[PDB]
Structure 1
Amino acid sequence: YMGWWGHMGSPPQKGIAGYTISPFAARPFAGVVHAAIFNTFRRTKNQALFVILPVSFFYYVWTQASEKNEWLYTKAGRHELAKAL
């Protein structure tokens, strides 16, 4: 499914002209400020919910469980612990 240089197995390409410049001719950090601020904000915003939703949910679940556990092993939580065991 993948070949090697010369016969990589791309469907025939025609009509794409690719241009690039030398690494020595380019500023490697051109527009780094713009990218670091605006591009990273864009990419972060677009992915934020995919991280925030499960982290916030499982942090809530952990928080509730750890608070209950703490409370069960207090004097006030004696009775509820006795029922749990």
Structure 2
Amino acid sequence: YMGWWGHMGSPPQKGIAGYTISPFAARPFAGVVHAAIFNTFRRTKNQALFVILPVSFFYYVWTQASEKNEWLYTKAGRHELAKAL
């Protein structure tokens, strides 16, 4: 499923003209400030839910579990601990 240079396995290409300029002719950091602020904000905003929802859910579960565990091993939690074991 992959060939090599000259016979890579692409369907025939026709009609595409590609253009580019030399690394010495270009400013490598052109538009960096716009990218760093606006591009990163867009990319991050669009993926935020997929991180926030699972992280926040599992952090909540952990927080509840660790707080209960802590309370069961106090004096106040003696009776509830006795039942739990």
Give the alignment's TM-score, normalised by structure 2: 0.98
Partner deviation per Cα, 1:9-67 (whole Å, 9 max, x = no partner):
01100011110000110100000000000000000000000000000000000000000
- Could you list the runs of 4 or more consecutive aligned residues of structure 1 that deviate by over 4 angstroms after TM superposition? none
| Structure 1 residues not aligned, in runs of 5+ | none
Percent of aligned pairs with the same amino acid: 100
Distance 1:29 1:14 in 2: 33
| Structure 2 residues not aligned, in runs of 5+ | none
Give the alignment's TM-score, normalised by structure 1: 0.98
